[PDB]
Design a protein around this ligand. Sequence first.
Ligand SMILES: *C(=O)N1C[C@H](NOS(=O)(=O)O)CC[C@H]1C(=O)NO[C@H]1CCNC1
Ligand SMILES: *C(=O)N1C[C@H](NOS(=O)(=O)O)CC[C@H]1C(=O)NO[C@H]1CCNC1
Ligand SMILES: [Cl-]
Ligand SMILES: [Co+2]
Ligand SMILES: [Co+2]
Ligand SMILES: [Co+2]
Ligand SMILES: [Co+2]
Ligand SMILES: [Co+2]
Lengths: 241, 241
Amino acid sequence: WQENKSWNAHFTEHKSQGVVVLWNENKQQGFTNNLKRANQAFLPASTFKIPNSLIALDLGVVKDEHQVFKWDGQTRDIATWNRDHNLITAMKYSVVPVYQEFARQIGEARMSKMLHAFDYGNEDISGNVDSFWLDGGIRISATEQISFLRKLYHNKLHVSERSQRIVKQAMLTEANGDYIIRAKTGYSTRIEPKIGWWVGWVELDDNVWFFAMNMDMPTSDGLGLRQAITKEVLKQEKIIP
Amino acid sequence: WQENKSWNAHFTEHKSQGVVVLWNENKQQGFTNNLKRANQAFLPASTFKIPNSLIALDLGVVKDEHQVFKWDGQTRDIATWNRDHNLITAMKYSVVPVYQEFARQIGEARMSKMLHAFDYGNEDISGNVDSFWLDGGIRISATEQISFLRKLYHNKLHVSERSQRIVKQAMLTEANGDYIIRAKTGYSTRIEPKIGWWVGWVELDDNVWFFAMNMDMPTSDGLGLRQAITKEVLKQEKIIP
Ligand SMILES: *C(=O)N1C[C@H](NOS(=O)(=O)O)CC[C@H]1C(=O)NO[C@H]1CCNC1
Ligand SMILES: *C(=O)N1C[C@H](NOS(=O)(=O)O)CC[C@H]1C(=O)NO[C@H]1CCNC1
Ligand SMILES: [Cl-]
Ligand SMILES: [Co+2]
Ligand SMILES: [Co+2]
Ligand SMILES: [Co+2]
Ligand SMILES: [Co+2]
Ligand SMILES: [Co+2]
């Protein structure tokens, strides 16, 4: 992991603090504005929807990306959560209660064994079965998210090829004639420090660039900056126009 | 299929003639500006890359979307063809010689069986094994394109589920927070009348709209009108913003 402090310009500019980590798959070389924070492990929060999805599909808790998970009737503070969802929309709107129920169905023994198979962060599921990635013992760094995502990208995780392809579909965030981004956002707020994440990758015609970023996120006002700052860095490195 | 001739203004203002066909999946209802032309069958040209891809994957002629098809060294008139490709970039840049190599390896017997299984247009593969879809006997209408694409969407074609998912990934054209388009363009130029195609679908949170369009295309300077006219229709119908 090579250090490039000049990306801090983009954080300073927006009165923010964080790290971006990039990984050039073809050259097998990684870059970050801050080596220490790149390796600092945090609660994954909604970024956990990646592994949680893989596990739920592999075990048949989720049958496919069209199966409907009916709203439980409880109205919650994000409006999009109060309605029926499938896997695609549950990821898009980051619908926690839908993933809490997958987690209960998975159960702590299958969950722990899967997270060891995935080498996922510290591999510790201490806490409630349905919230450990929000306020429990699990921790992962920006560099460990990249390691994990690379395996997903190559269908190398110990779940079916099919589960992996479905999750990569459900990760689709943006695409045009220049690139494809598959990614997941997250916002850790239950346990200090409040931080925002975006992890995933950019597919080009002849390379892929993995990314993982996190940043201080005192309130939800600055969440747009997860993507905006990442993209500023991608632009600076000529990955996207 | 209900006729909506008001879409004609979008062809007219572009000095063009053609058909857009739309199918609302939830409601099981179709719409077109021109019922006759909707049903008129033409050579599929490069839109044939959809079934051809499925067949190549299902038979193992293509191992996966990463397999590299090396440039054969012959300089062709579309510059993006004169380089190595994989399935994703062969579709994106519509690299005919790569697909002609597939057709040759598939062979006429399996090709014909497959197209019968797909109910692909007139199911007639008469002509050269390596170009029947460009100057042979196969013909398919816009509405037949929709029928085929609905199967692919639901994984109901007689090829593996894996093949269908890989082809739907390769069709990815555009994605954002409003919609995902999976589609394939074509331009039939070898046999009159010269026509351009765009076929695929738009995925929304809660519905999918299939589309197939073709239009007269005397020269390559009107090619961007395939997408432009289609999108003006989609926007008039409030399917996309
Ligand atoms: C994930 O980290 N979640 C769920 C939502 N994810 O959105 S995000 O991917 O854009 O970051 C929102 C943040 C976080 C979460 O759980 N927030 O808490 C909920 C509980 C009530 N307030 C919202
Ligand atoms: C498909 O119909 N093809 C291949 C290319 N497709 O691009 S497009 O999908 O945007 O329509 C180009 C058009 C067409 C084709 O075969 N054209 O002819 C070839 C031979 C010489 N000119 C290129
Ligand atoms: Cl996809
Ligand atoms: Co900047
Ligand atoms: Co371990
Ligand atoms: Co340990
Ligand atoms: Co352990
Ligand atoms: Co289905």
